[PDB]
């Protein structure tokens, strides 16, 4: 699902996160920055798990409550 890069939101890791499922989730260290690509799940459903792109370049899902949106 597309979007205007220009209203893109960024986030910061509040805590370390270890992927229980490396195929669907990405790792985070407190403090890391990432771009929120989508807040839906792989099925377009609302989700407490969001798809993001981190600094190292990995794409995947992280727990919404482990991050803070920068505004």
């Amino acid at each position: 699902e597309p979007i205007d890069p220009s209203k893109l939101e960024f986030a910061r890791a509040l805590y370390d996160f270890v992927p229980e499922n490396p195929e669907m989730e990405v790792a985070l260290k407190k403090g890391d920055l990432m771009a929120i690509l989508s807040k839906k799940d792989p099925l377009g459903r609302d989700s407490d798990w969001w798809k993001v792109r981190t600094k190292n370049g990995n794409i995947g899902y992280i727990p919404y409550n482990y991050i803070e949106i920068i505004k």
């Binding site: 805590y15 669907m24 407490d48 727990p63």
Partner: peptide, 10 residues
Amino acid sequence: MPPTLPHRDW
């Protein structure tokens, strides 16, 4: 000290 993880569907 780490927040509870939200339920995931996979």
